[model samples]
Target: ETDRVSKEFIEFLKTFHKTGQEIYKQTKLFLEGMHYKRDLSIEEQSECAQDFYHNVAERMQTRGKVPPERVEKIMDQIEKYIMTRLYKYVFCPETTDDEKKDLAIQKRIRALRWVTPQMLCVPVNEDIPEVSDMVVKAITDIIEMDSKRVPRDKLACITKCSKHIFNAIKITKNEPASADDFLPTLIYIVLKGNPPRLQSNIQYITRFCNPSRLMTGEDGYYFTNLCCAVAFIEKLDAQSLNLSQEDFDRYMSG
Candidate 1:
């Protein structure tokens, strides 16, 4: 199973490399379309998004004649990109009063629901230690279930995890999502041992480390040696599993 997914993922990425730019364009355009539809009726708003994604899927088919099953998997990754990269920027509260609007809060919560535990990308090194049942579900779901089909409670953990981090850092509503603030929750994920594997970690770190999101150096990890990167993240800070900002920076630079 691992070998198959890994091989398929490599193929998927090779295809994505050629087509990803247009995927980003379509994603942004779709969100912009959604922005305009906010004043429309609910059914109309629903229909507006359907067309763009439909077109995206079709556009995908024309490129290199990717097999339908592979296309399905690739689309899941693309949708995840939208969920992670686009939703927060498009729907999140721009001002405090925005949260009071039913639509704003609803969209915010909806975005929250879309945050899968796989998105966290932490290596879970234990056998599911005792934690909140909600968190337990969160751990297993990302590890065991389809990345696209997380349960309600498990998905709720994203918001919960983010909140826990934000409060610890005294983060304010006015502030953007900080990688620093997220570190606490990420460390908690690491400590909890829920995710036990490194594929997601490698994917995320490779993405972040590219363009050198922070300053580590050219020796940084990419797809080629990601497990080393994961270990670097785990031990980068030194004495334990607590990932430090410095370590994070070092890995990104590398």
Candidate 2:
């Protein structure tokens, strides 16, 4: 899959070498400028990033240099390229509370290691081979989240994980699973997977992804559920898992 994506990226670069190089150079300068402006709040930095992205897209459209059909792909590639370069400098930068949140979420997920799918009423048993395969796919996708350079890619991970989860539920229940079922399954996956930089990734996508992407569609829905899963993990207690105080205490202590 990585090789396939790299091949496609190389093809795009060859087809539009000049324009691609120009955008990449400009993006490098933009990212450098952002690095120097460390005083700016993360919110301000995000706004600037979004404006620059839209400007790039608009310029390509008005210049009529690239084919209209390829504009979106070009824009996506540009974002991916720029973000891959800018990730370390911008993502969870010292200007924000993201690192602290990352640590807290990691700790929470670790403490919740005892959580079982059955406790959450989410069917994730490995006894059924197909269900186990789907669960493993979902967990793999969740772990892959941190390696993504752009929100689009990160969002794609969530969407893929959600589909895997939905498939798992469908296979086990032999029925369509609603959000009620979906969310717990997602929470279970998050707890089990303990994805790297969980907090930072979520904030990165929320701040930088196009507003329209987060505002509507299946991506938005799954992203929102992922957020809910994190939130649920943070505030989890006996009641949330439908367990009595005694059982919860015993599980936590044992």
Candidate 3:
């Protein structure tokens, strides 16, 4: 019914086929604009995202009886944001044949569950269940998932947590859950089909909060507070701390 979005998508697919990188950059910009809305949770972002989906769906459902140009306009609307997370065609590694190790590996390695990417502008500086899911979803989106292009085996490890590989945008490995690398497996489902460059900043930890505690051995409040400040770290002269020699040379001076 919607001729516009369909036609535009036909053209869009052409670009995707040529160089996924071009599609990647364009999709990143498209999602960045669409997702940077004022929302935190994925559920909250849905209503706002559906506006775009409905536009496309409406055009497909009713365009033949109306003007052809209207169909094109609808397509134009769809193109404006094809990069956003559209969950209908989600990439679930569960679909792969479990019996085949290679196929399973492929399914998870490059797997991505498609959906409207969530715009996490200011993450809540706490480690909660919902927040954790967000992390996993972001990494999943960056992983490539084109059925016709990458074989199912390539997606085997698609369910891996983003923290270990991709890392969270601002999360650290502080005491155990300073809120950085909390949730990678869950976030994977919500953040699919985006470009790779957008994920480059995951390793830059700011000096604001303590790093997330993934492997640190401190157990008591004395140890926690003792590590929160730069002064304590400097006085302790901790070698093997996250800030390397170059990191100290570059940022410690400030």
* Top candidate when judged by lDDT against the true structure: 2
In model 2, what lDDT does residue 71 have?
81
Query: TM-score for every candidate vs. truth?
Result: 0.31, 0.85, 0.20
Query: How are the candidates ranked when ordered by TM-score, highest leading?
Result: 2, 1, 3
Model 2 vs truth, CA RMSD: 3.3
For model 2, residues 144-213, the per-residue Cα lDDT tens digits are 9998878888999999999999999999888888767989999999998999999999999998887657
Worst 10 residues of 2 by lDDT: 1-10
Displacement of the residue 210 alpha carbon in candidate 1, Å: 30
What does candidate 1 score on TM? 0.31
Task: Say which prediction, candidate 1 or candidate 3, comes out ahead on lDDT.
Answer: 1
lDDT of every predicted structure (CA atoms):
0.41, 0.84, 0.33
- The Cα RMSD of model 1 versus the native structure comes to 19.6
Q: Which parts of model 3 are misplaced by more than 4 Å?
A: 1-35, 63-254
For model 1, which pairs clash? 124-196, 216-253, 217-253, 217-254, 219-254, 220-254
lDDT of 1 by residue, 1-254 (tens): 33453344445565667675566566667766666655664335434544554677788778646567776666655444443432333232243232344343233323333223333443222233322443444444333422322122223333344334344333332345554334534444333433422333233222222222212432231122223323433443322333466664554455
Please list the Cα RMSD from the true structure of every candidate, rounded to 1 decimal place. 19.6, 3.3, 19.7
| Poorly placed runs, candidate 2 (over 4 Å) | 1-29, 63-69
